[PDB]
Design a protein around this ligand. Structure first.
Ligand SMILES: [Mg+2]
Ligand SMILES: [Mg+2]
Ligand SMILES: [Mg+2]
Ligand SMILES: [Mg+2]
Ligand SMILES: [Mg+2]
Ligand SMILES: [Mg+2]
Ligand SMILES: [Mg+2]
Ligand SMILES: [Mg+2]
Ligand SMILES: [Mg+2]
Ligand SMILES: [Mg+2]
Ligand SMILES: [Mg+2]
Ligand SMILES: [Mg+2]
Ligand SMILES: [Mg+2]
Ligand SMILES: [Mg+2]
Ligand SMILES: [Mg+2]
Ligand SMILES: [Mg+2]
Ligand SMILES: [Mg+2]
Ligand SMILES: [Mg+2]
Ligand SMILES: [Mg+2]
Ligand SMILES: [Mg+2]
Ligand SMILES: [Mg+2]
Ligand SMILES: [Mg+2]
Ligand SMILES: [Mg+2]
Ligand SMILES: [Mg+2]
Ligand SMILES: [Mg+2]
Ligand SMILES: [Mg+2]
Ligand SMILES: [Mg+2]
Ligand SMILES: [Mg+2]
Ligand SMILES: [Mg+2]
Ligand SMILES: [Mg+2]
Ligand SMILES: [Mg+2]
Ligand SMILES: [Mg+2]
Ligand SMILES: [Mg+2]
Ligand SMILES: [Mg+2]
Ligand SMILES: [Mg+2]
Ligand SMILES: [Mg+2]
Lengths: 140, 97, 187, 99, 166, 115, 95, 104
RNA sequence: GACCAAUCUAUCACCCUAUAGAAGAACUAAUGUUAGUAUAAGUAACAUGAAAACAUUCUCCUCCGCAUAAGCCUGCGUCAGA
RNA sequence: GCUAAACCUAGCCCCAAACCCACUCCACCUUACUACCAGCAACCUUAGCCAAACCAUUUACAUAAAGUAUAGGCGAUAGAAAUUGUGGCGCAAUAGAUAUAGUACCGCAAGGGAAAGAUGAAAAAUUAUAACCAAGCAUAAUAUAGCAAGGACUAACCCCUAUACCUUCUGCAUAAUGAAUUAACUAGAAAUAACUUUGCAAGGAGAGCCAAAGCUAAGACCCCCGAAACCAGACGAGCUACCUAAGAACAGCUAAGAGCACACCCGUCUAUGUAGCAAAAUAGUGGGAAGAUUUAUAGGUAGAGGCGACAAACCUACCGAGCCUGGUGAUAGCUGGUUGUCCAAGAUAGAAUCUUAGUUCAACUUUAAAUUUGCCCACAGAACCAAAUCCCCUUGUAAAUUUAACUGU
């Protein structure tokens, strides 16, 4: 032959190194190993958004469970927390609820106070308390 | 397995060989040798071609019309078959037309 | 360069022509003539056919410009050298090698002369027993040999002949017919 | 491909952030080639960048093998014992400096 | 071709010191080219693994199988070599440690079907390896009782940490 | 074109290049070209301006093949022309003939066979 | 079309095009409208006058005719007396 | 016989790596390896911790008694680390006790 | 459009790399071809009449057997090992 | 570790150079390897596939002139002269000649056709290298669940996810074909013309060819396997159909191309067999069995033919006309495939076509370049027998025309 193939086994090894823990011929035969590695890479690249959504849902469920244990709901709690210029993501909320029950208890108390103040305002239109905890701090 | 095991021996190569040290020498004799011999006559190869690029079919027709008078029977038949196949594939089969 | 590789196509291959296992008969893959590129030991589908040749000429002015460029490169690079007569006091390769090493020339000193008939026996014998130094007449000067070697050596007559033959290429009329003809003005 | 690849929890080698800061890089061995077009970048580095790099942090010692090598490599050892033997085959001076 | 089991018998270890164990002597032996299948040889090997040499020979002497006599002769030759060459005093203090049986170099023949066809008839050949280690045989791994299962469950429940957080 | 009458067949025939293999042809020769040649040295006016002199000076490169039987003349450089020399060209017009004669020249015509 | 001949190994020109067309150095192909010599009694004078006039070719048609010809036909035409002498060269053009 | 060479070299390197992975040799001291320095390495180690101290004393602080005995036995065919180590451990214990008493 | 695994050629290299010239220059498939090996699978098919001193005897069947034209060429005798 | 994996040297292709071989001893045209005895032999236009989308006349066997004249269902095409003038940028046992050899094997016949081997200085070295590299197994069998993989997890499973690849077609896991892996072989050769860069310039090229800025030189572009089927001569009546010469067979019983019934000839039916005993077998019921009966031996009838109690049946297992050779690597609007990484632009109104499974033009799309207007645009302008549409300044913008290319729809 003329300048035939002389560097093929290394390609097979590089393709199989990612298949050193599969079942069946997927960890030996190159034909099926190629498709297996391709599918594995595609799924690993597509599962990032799924992982993000799963983590978000898990944090939401944890915060809802903490609120229920403290005596509140997740939507109302989030609304009251947002209605106080106290922006806090869900990860920190879950971490506090897990490793800081007193912090989450104080946060739930503040949320309930804000809820009651908003209800009183909507009922009587203020005049002129405007909620001691309400009244956002203006900026310029 | 397709790949062998033991490496090969040291492929010795004499860069200063008699032909390498004299490769290309005595060429271009026309531009300075008051034009006495064309470089196309320096190459040592076939007799039917010695300074004409051409193509496959053209080279085959050349070899036929220049050596076909003293070629073997089987060789001449194979050359004729090759010429006919090349013609049928070029002047009919292909693309861009 | 003139290639020489030649394969055997499916037609030029010996044997074959029948029809093993008919189409609608056996349940094997459809096949026609044995020795096909899909079989073992058959002919090559596409390959080198006959001895090819990548021959093609270039303008003489392009060659002259290339030679001038090679000369300028060998000169500006502190590699060119001019002499008066390629002679030696004895004619031993050891003496020439020692002189080249002392003068800090290099290893591959390309010596050039003219005529080829006026070569002295001393330098001839000194160069006919080495692998780096080679005696080549001015008539046989190219670019490959100049770029392959390190330094270059020339003499007054060689330089004059080279300059004349490289300047004649400039300021000339059309060839009309091959320059091999006698020509009046041209010698 | 995490299931088929080992993992490790984030941590430090000695909590250098608390007290003093110790350079984790230990030594550097350059295998430059004198005659060879496959180490021009490494040569230019060892010429006009290695001195500045060594003087910018005296807590690291660098060596220069300068042996007949066909592929220039760099051995980056560490205190814990890890070794990162990388290759710098055909690389600009800026790329080698950044690496 | 690849002979190695016969070469393993020439391994040499350095001289042991007084403050060191006895190190049970290992034995290696195998017969090449055996006109027999491989699945039955592996069955016989699995049958003769944890048992000693005496029980192995006793079971082989009453095993209606062609390979039984071959395995018995192989074990007898291995015991003789161990008592003679490898230097071993006790003849019954040897037990089987490893036993396999791989295929050999097979030929090819024709069977001739009832039509214009046929099939390849390979001459299945096999081998037989055995490893006899000095000393008495080890006891069989007893089944884990309920206490072991409870301990494993308690360990698994105690070795669990929070997930997806600090 | 799939089977229909191709475009290059639907057009009828005509005697366009009928006798094209025999129609005499001559390379044009401009008076400005002659003046430029005389000024650049080649084709000196001290000798007859025969076809050999023009071929040597390489002013109008012709070819024996291609049904060419000499060289013709053109009345381009009618003005700013001063050569004064016997010119020999196969064809010539009255305008250029007079333009050359008034300058002291002698216009003539000949016929060169193929060989 | 014959891309490669069987004797010399070169291209071949279709004589039909050479007989039904006319080459010009300017890069255009001249032709003649068909029907200029059949059923002339039923054609109105305007139609007969329009049919007795030459016509040029399109870009694709000109390229096809060129492909069907060789470089030999692209030579000049310094005829002693030809009516198409003032058409081989095109002057006054800006894209 | 494939006309490959670089692929053969890569395969030989892979086989050498596999052999090294098979029977890995014992971990030899880094001092015996080729690329190694003593004075420069000691200076780099001293400058890494960000301070300044004598070099001869630091060198002597690394010489043990068993090492000196082995060197003498080999030569038959540079002080010690007793007082220095004692002072170091005493100072470390005192500092740790003081810190624990001041903070706890 | 930008790169690039393998080879030969001219160039310092020389624990394997660079500049240009060439493609029989780069396989998960063409009921593709060659070589070994899984799959049904140890599944389908299969023979050797009985006792015994291995001398010998017993049970059953037979349209089969004898020599030859056609046809084969040493093809169940001895000697040693399989 | 069983089985395995590599070695490279014998030899092959090209021309470069000469023009080659050929009876020791017997034997060889009769039945070839046969010591021996009365009878004609020779010279033959090659056809055919294929392209014109069929196909009859038609289609090929140093340089320039010139792919010109000329011939041609004047269309697909064919195409002259006078003049001129001693090594491999090769192959290294699936490659190279098929070759260790034209060897068995199919075979009565023409005819087709492969591999043997691997360390070396001593195999008259005992004694083995370093195990490691694919496919099948042992060391080491499985433990809810579901394209065999991911996020993970302190952990294997347990938690959530997602309908194998390629080709076709508007549409896919689809139940449309392809597939058991591994190692080797295996599928884009270039053209008038065009684009980019070198050198000179109204000239260049190492005669010939082109010139109202041109030419030269280089770089870059045109796949494989697959039928039915024809021509000319060999090989084929040892089985089948017919003919020719000389021979053989037909118990017995009842009594004449008579009847039953041995041997014997063929097989109307059942059952088994269906990769079996057999690429056409086993039992009786079946017709004949001194006659149009069967058969041992030899010769003759060969494909546009022979033969034929016509079954258009047979002619060596497949005969609506057996195989081989050389034309045929035939052709083919048709099935299948057409090998490494990454970036960008990238969906078509219709017409013709012995045509709608195919081709061309047009239209869409891509590249380099010169030009200036490209789209919604506002008053208005645009017919007697409803949503609407065309031109359209300022206004948003940056798009549009053309030139030279060429694949793709
Ligand atoms: Mg989200
Ligand atoms: Mg053939
Ligand atoms: Mg072949
Ligand atoms: Mg039609
Ligand atoms: Mg493969
Ligand atoms: Mg299939
Ligand atoms: Mg395949
Ligand atoms: Mg089964
Ligand atoms: Mg029996
Ligand atoms: Mg055809
Ligand atoms: Mg046809
Ligand atoms: Mg002639
Ligand atoms: Mg071969
Ligand atoms: Mg071969
Ligand atoms: Mg394996
Ligand atoms: Mg998976
Ligand atoms: Mg595909
Ligand atoms: Mg397809
Ligand atoms: Mg469709
Ligand atoms: Mg399916
Ligand atoms: Mg121009
Ligand atoms: Mg017969
Ligand atoms: Mg009959
Ligand atoms: Mg019936
Ligand atoms: Mg059946
Ligand atoms: Mg009847
Ligand atoms: Mg009867
Ligand atoms: Mg009777
Ligand atoms: Mg036939
Ligand atoms: Mg064929
Ligand atoms: Mg084909
Ligand atoms: Mg059709
Ligand atoms: Mg299909
Ligand atoms: Mg391929
Ligand atoms: Mg895009
Ligand atoms: Mg029609």
């Amino acid at each position: 032959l003329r300048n035939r193939v002389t560097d093929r086994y290394f390609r097979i090894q590089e393709v199989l190194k990612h298949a050193r823990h599969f079942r069946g011929r997927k960890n030996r035969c190159y034909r099926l190993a190629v498709r297996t590695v391709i599918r594995a890479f595609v799924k690993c690249t597509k599962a990032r958004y799924l992982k993000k959504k799963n983590m978000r849902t898990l944090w939401i469920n944890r915060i809802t469970a903490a609120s229920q244990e403290h005596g509140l709901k997740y939507p109302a709690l989030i609304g009251n927390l947002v209605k106080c210029q106290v922006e806090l993501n869900r990860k920190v909320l879950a971490d506090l609820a897990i490793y800081e029950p007193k912090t989450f208890k104080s946060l739930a108390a503040l949320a309930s106070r804000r809820r009651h103040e908003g209800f009183a305002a909507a009922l009587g239109d203020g005049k002129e308390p405007e909620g001691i905890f309400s009244r956002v701090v203006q900026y310029h | 397995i397709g790949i062998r095991l033991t490496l090969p021996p040291p492929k010795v190569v004499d860069r200063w060989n008699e032909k390498r040290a004299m490769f290309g020498v005595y060429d271009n004799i026309g531009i300075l040798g008051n034009f006495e011999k064309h470089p196309k006559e320096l190459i040592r190869g076939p007799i039917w071609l010695r300074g004409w690029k051409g193509n496959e079919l053209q080279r085959c027709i050349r070899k036929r019309k220049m050596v076909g008078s003293r070629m073997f029977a089987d060789d001449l038949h194979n050359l004729n078959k090759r010429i006919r196949y090349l013609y049928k594939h070029f002047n009919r089969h292909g693309k861009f037309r | 360069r003139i290639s020489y590789a030649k394969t055997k196509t499916r037609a030029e291959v010996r044997g074959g022509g029948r029809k093993p296992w008919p189409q609608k008969g056996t349940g094997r893959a459809r096949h026609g003539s044995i020795r096909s590129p899909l079989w073992r030991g058959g002919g090559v589908a596409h390959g080198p056919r006959g001895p090819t040749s990548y021959y093609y000429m270039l303008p003489m002015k392009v060659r002259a410009l290339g030679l001038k460029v090679a000369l300028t490169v060998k000169l500006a690079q502190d590699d060119l050298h001019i002499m008066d007569s390629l002679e030696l006091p004895t004619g031993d390769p050891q003496y020439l090698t020692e002189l080249a090493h002392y003068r800090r020339w290099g290893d591959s000193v390309l010596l050039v002369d003219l005529t080829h008939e006026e070569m002295p026996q001393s330098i001839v014998e000194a160069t006919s027993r080495l692998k780096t130094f080679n005696l080549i007449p001015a008539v046989g000067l190219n670019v490959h040999s100049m770029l392959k070697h390190q330094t270059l050596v020339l003499t007054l007559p060689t330089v004059a002949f080279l300059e004349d033959k490289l300047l004649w290429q400039d300021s000339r009329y059309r060839p009309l017919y091959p320059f091999s003809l006698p020509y009046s003005d041209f010698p | 491909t995490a299931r088929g690849t080992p993992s490790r929890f984030l941590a430090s080698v000695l909590h250098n952030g608390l007290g003093r800061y110790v350079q984790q890089l230990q030594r550097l061995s350059f295998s430059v080639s004198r005659d060879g077009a496959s180490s021009r970048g490494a040569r230019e580095f060892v010429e006009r960048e290695v001195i500045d790099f060594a003087r910018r942090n005296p807590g690291v010692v660098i060596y220069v093998n300068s042996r007949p090598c066909c592929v220039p490599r760099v051995v980056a050892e560490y205190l814990n014992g890890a070794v990162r033997e990388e290759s710098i085959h055909c690389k600009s001076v800026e790329e080698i400096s950044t690496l | 071709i690849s002979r190695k089991w016969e070469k393993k018998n020439k391994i040499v270890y350095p001289p042991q010191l007084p403050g060191e164990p006895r190190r049970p002597a290992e034995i290696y032996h195998c017969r090449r080219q055996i006109k027999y299948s491989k699945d039955k040889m592996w069955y016989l090997a699995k049958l003769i693994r944890g048992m000693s040499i005496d029980q192995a020979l006793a079971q082989l002497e009453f095993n209606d199988k062609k390979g039984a006599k071959i395995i018995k002769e192989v074990l007898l030759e291995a015991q003789d070599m161990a008592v003679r060459d490898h230097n071993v005093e006790f003849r019954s203090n040897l037990y089987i440690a490893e036993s396999t049986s791989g295929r050999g170099q097979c030929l090819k023949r024709i069977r001739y079907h009832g039509r214009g066809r046929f099939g390849i008839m390979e001459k299945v050949y096999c081998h037989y390896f055995v490893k006899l280690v000095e000393g008495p045989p080890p006891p069989p791994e007893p089944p884990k009782t309920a206490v072991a299962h409870a301990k494993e469950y308690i360990q698994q429940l105690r070795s669990r940490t929070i997930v997806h957080t600090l | 074109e799939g089977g229909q009458t191709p475009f290059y067949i639907r057009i009828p025939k005509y005697g366009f290049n009928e006798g094209h293999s025999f129609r005499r042809q001559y390379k044009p020769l401009s008076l400005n070209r002659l003046q430029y040649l005389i000024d650049l040295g080649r084709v000196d006016p001290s000798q007859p301006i025969d076809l050999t002199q023009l071929v040597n000076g390489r002013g109008v490169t012709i070819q024996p093949l291609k049904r060419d039987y000499g060289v013709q003349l053109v009345e381009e450089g009618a003005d700013t022309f001063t050569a004064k020399v016997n010119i020999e060209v196969q064809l010539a017009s009255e305008l250029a003939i007079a333009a050359i004669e008034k300058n002291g020249g002698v216009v003539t015509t000949a016929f060169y066979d193929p060989r | 079309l014959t891309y490669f001949s069987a004797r010399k190994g070169k291209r071949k020109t279709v004589k039909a095009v050479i007989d039904r067309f006319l080459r010009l150095h300017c890069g255009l192909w001249v032709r003649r409208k068909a029907g200029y010599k059949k059923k002339l009694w039923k054609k109105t004078p305007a139609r007969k006058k329009r049919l007795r006039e030459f016509v040029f070719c399109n870009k694709t048609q000109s390229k096809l005719l060129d492909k069907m010809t060789t470089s030999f036909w692209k030579r000049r035409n310094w005829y002693v007396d030809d009516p198409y002498q003032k058409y081989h060269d095109r002057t006054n053009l800006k894209v | 016989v494939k006309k490959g060479f670089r692929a053969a070299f890569r395969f030989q390197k892979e086989l050498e790596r596999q052999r090294l992975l098979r029977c890995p040799p014992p971990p030899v001291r880094r001092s015996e390896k080729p690329n190694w320095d003593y004075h420069a390495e000691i200076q780099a180690f001293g400058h890494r911790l960000q301070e300044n101290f004598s070099l001869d004393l630091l060198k002597t602080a690394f010489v043990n008694s068993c090492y000196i005995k082995s060197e003498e036995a080999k030569r038959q065919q540079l002080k010690s680390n007793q007082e220095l180590s004692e002072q170091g451990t005493s100072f470390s214990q005192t500092c740790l006790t003081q810190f624990l008493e001041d903070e706890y």
